[PDB]
Amino acid sequence: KVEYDLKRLRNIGIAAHIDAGKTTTTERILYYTGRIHKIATITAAVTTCFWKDHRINIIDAPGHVDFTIEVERSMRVLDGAIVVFDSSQGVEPQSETVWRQAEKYKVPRIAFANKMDKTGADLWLVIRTMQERLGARPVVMQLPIGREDTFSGIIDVLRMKAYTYGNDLGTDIREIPIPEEYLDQAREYHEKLVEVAADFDENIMLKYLEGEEPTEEELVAAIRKGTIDLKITPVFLGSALKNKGVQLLLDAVVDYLPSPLDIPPIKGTTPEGEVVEIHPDPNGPLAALAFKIMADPYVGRLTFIRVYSGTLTSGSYVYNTTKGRKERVARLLRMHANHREEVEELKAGDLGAVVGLKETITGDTLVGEDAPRVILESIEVPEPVIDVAIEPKTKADQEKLSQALARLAEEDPTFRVSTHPETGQTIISGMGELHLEIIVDRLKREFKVDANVGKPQVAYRETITKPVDVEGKFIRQTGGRGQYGHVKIKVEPLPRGSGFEFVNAIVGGVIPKEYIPAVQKGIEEAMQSGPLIGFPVVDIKVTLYDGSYHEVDSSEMAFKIAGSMAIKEAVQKGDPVILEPIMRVEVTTPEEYMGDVIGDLNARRGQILGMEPRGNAQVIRAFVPLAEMFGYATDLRSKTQGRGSFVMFFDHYQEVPKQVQEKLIK
Ligand SMILES: Nc1nc2c(ncn2[C@@H]2O[C@H](COP(=O)(O)OP(=O)(O)O)[C@@H](O)[C@H]2O)c(=O)[nH]1
Ligand SMILES: [Mg+2]
Numbered sequence: 001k002v003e004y005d006l007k008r009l010r011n012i013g014i015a016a017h018i019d020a021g022k023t024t025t026t027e028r029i030l031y032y033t034g035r036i037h038k039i040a041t042i043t044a045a046v047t048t049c050f051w052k053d054h055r056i057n058i059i060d061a062p063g064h065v066d067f068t069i070e071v072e073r074s075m076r077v078l079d080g081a082i083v084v085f086d087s088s089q090g091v092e093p094q095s096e097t098v099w100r101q102a103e104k105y106k107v108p109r110i111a112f113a114n115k116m117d118k119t120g121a122d123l124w125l126v127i128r129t130m131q132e133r134l135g136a137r138p139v140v141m142q143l144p145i146g147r148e149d150t151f152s153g154i155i156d157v158l159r160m161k162a163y164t165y166g167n168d169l170g171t172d173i174r175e176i177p178i179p180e181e182y183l184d185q186a187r188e189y190h191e192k193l194v195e196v197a198a199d200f201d202e203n204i205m206l207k208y209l210e211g212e213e214p215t216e217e218e219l220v221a222a223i224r225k226g227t228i229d230l231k232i233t234p235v236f237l238g239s240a241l242k243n244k245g246v247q248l249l250l251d252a253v254v255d256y257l258p259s260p261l262d263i264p265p266i267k268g269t270t271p272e273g274e275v276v277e278i279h280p281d282p283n284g285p286l287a288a289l290a291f292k293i294m295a296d297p298y299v300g301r302l303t304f305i306r307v308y309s310g311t312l313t314s315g316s317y318v319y320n321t322t323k324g325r326k327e328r329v330a331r332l333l334r335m336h337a338n339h340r341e342e343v344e345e346l347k348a349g350d351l352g353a354v355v356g357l358k359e360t361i362t363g364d365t366l367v368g369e370d371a372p373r374v375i376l377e378s379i380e381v382p383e384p385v386i387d388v389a390i391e392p393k394t395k396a397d398q399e400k401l402s403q404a405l406a407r408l409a410e411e412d413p414t415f416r417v418s419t420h421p422e423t424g425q426t427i428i429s430g431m432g433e434l435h436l437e438i439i440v441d442r443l444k445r446e447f448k449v450d451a452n453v454g455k456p457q458v459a460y461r462e463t464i465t466k467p468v469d470v471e472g473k474f475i476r477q478t479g480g481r482g483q484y485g486h487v488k489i490k491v492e493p494l495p496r497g498s499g500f501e502f503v504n505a506i507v508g509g510v511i512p513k514e515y516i517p518a519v520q521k522g523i524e525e526a527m528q529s530g531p532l533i534g535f536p537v538v539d540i541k542v543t544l545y546d547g548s549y550h551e552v553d554s555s556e557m558a559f560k561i562a563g564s565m566a567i568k569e570a571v572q573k574g575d576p577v578i579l580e581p582i583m584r585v586e587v588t589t590p591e592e593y594m595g596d597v598i599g600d601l602n603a604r605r606g607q608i609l610g611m612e613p614r615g616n617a618q619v620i621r622a623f624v625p626l627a628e629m630f631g632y633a634t635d636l637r638s639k640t641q642g643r644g645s646f647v648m649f650f651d652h653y654q655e656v657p658k659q660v661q662e663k664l665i666k
Pocket of ligand 1: 016017018019020021022023024025114115116117118238239240241242
């Protein structure tokens with residue numbers, strides 16, 4: 001027997017500018033691969049299929065489309081990529097953005113000039129622009145027969161044969177000889193191809209010299225080596241829509257894209273912090289990454305995983321190293337184009353879905369019960385730095401918004417719901433504009449919740465900068481009785497990020513013990529709104545140390561208020577100050593636009609940390625206030641002729657300069 005072979009795995013992702021043909025190309029890969037296995041929602045995060053004895057796991061799901069969380073993780077999870085270019089989109093400036101991503105995560109790729117049928121279809125413009133702008137070193141693997149409407153065929157220039165397509169349905173294909181008017185062009189590019197292969201094979205170099213045509217297999221193997229070691233980009237061509245070229249692209253996935261053997265081992269960290277390489281050994285200890293959780297309308301919660309080492313067995317227990325608990329793997333599944341398949345196991349190099357696993361979230365590492373504890377993804381609590389207010393038009397929209405968030409907080413445990421202290425509205429808080437922007441689209445559409453949605457707003461905080469010693473006195477005859485509460489507190493600043501710290505130095509019934517929770521609750525509520533701009537108070541330690549009470553007039557109501565009053569007083573007395581989030585920012589740019597990107601970041605109150613090169617591009621690292629980063633994606637495209645791209649992570653909170661302090665009151 002046999003079925004699992006590591007050499008025959010081909011984990012891929014299709015990377016394309018929006019509208020280039022990612023989806024159509026994927027659908028067509030799924031149609032052609034599913035033909036043999038028929039006479040003996042979609043899409044899923046990973047969809048398996050078969051071609052010429054090889055298993056191709058097609059990694060997607062994102063959604064989005066700027067969402068760096070989903071993109072990073074999905075790149076570690078695939079081994080190789082097909083970058084689809086639109087042949088008819090002339091400049092295609094943001095098609096560069098997705099190339100930079102593949103370069104960033106060191107993923108071997110082939111290219112597919114995908115709309116040859118269309119008006120404007122220009123293979124050569126794709127090759128030249130790949131050369132000049134991306135520094136990709138493309139190698140022409142195919143030549144088109146016909147142009148635009150009359151696009152009828154494709155020449156494979158490696159093997160010196162061609163194919164004609166008798167229809168647009170993908171149901172008539174015939175190995176033809178290279179026709180007359182194309183044959184000279186094929187000889188030129190075939191020996192250009194042989195020339196490129198000679199750089200990664202000394203045997204082929206010696207053959208090229210003599211004019212001896214090398215063996216097809218030696219040629220495939222040399223282009224493959226150069227592809228996998230990131231020195232060339234084989235280019236193929238077609239119309240996905242008109243079912244021309246998609247079977248040859250599938251051949252290229254097997255010929256040139258990597259198995260999980262061919263790429264460097266994934267890097268992981270022990271709990272000790274020692275970095276280690278994780279080899280794809282199916283009989284080794286299990287190590288696996290959850291990279292997408294998925295609600296399902298049949299089997300329920302599905303966590304999609306990539307096994308890097310060992311074997312994951314259905315009916316086993318695995319250890320979630322990020323959290324600290326055993327979980328039960330109930331079942332394993334592969335998602336095919338039309339159907340599900342139950343499987344007994346997923347070995348190293350492979351991907352699928354596990355039912356079970358209730359407490360595992362995206363990015364979590366799963367290892368064997370008695371296996372080395374490794375953490376693949378670096379741990380980080382991502383800060384809710386952006387809030388959006390949201391008001392349902394009726395009471396009927398209130399309860400189905402409450403369901404929209406409690407049900408969407410389980411798939412995505414990374415946002416934070418609350419209620420504005422001085423208004424009373426629902427406030428979703430998250431890692432960015434676009435995290436909240438698509439939560440809002442899932443709310444109004446998928447959960448049918450129409451609501452008055454407010455401007456995105458940065459999550460400012462407030463704190464004090466010197467120690468203070470203050471009172472709160474609530475003493476009133478209100479609502480038919482006397483009320484009395486009296487607190488004294490020392491408040492002092494805590495180290496940035498340390499949070500909140502309450503200390504009871506009440507020494508002798510000076511405030512009766514029964515009212516001590518009341519004063520804490522008062523302190524708590526009053527910290528929700530600071531004196532400067534009404535935003536939460538953080539990073540302080542409060543110490544209750546004196547007070548008084550009245551024999552009959554004191555109450556929890558009175559001491560709570562006395563607590564609020566004391567906190568209000570202290571924050572205003574304590575040289576208060578606004579804290580804003582500061583983001584880590586990596587901008588990728590062409591070098592001619594590079595001085596202009598630095599200057600613009602400095603005008604945004606940025607500090608430049610340092611730039612290193614990435615391909616023919618340049619990666620600038622910097623700190624900038626998130627408050628200064630609004631509308632940045634458009635402003636960056638303006639100063640890079642659309643070729644730039646960035647990613648943005650929370651780093652720390654810092655004290656705003658007093659010039660900004662004044663601007664924020666209104
Ligand atoms: N004319 C032409 N259109 C295509 C081709 N491939 C895809 N499209 C169309 O381009 C549009 C966007 O396609 P899609 O695959 O969804 O792009 P995506 O956003 O990158 O997933 C769709 O309406 C497709 O039908 C092609 O080969 N030729
Ligand atoms: Mg799509």
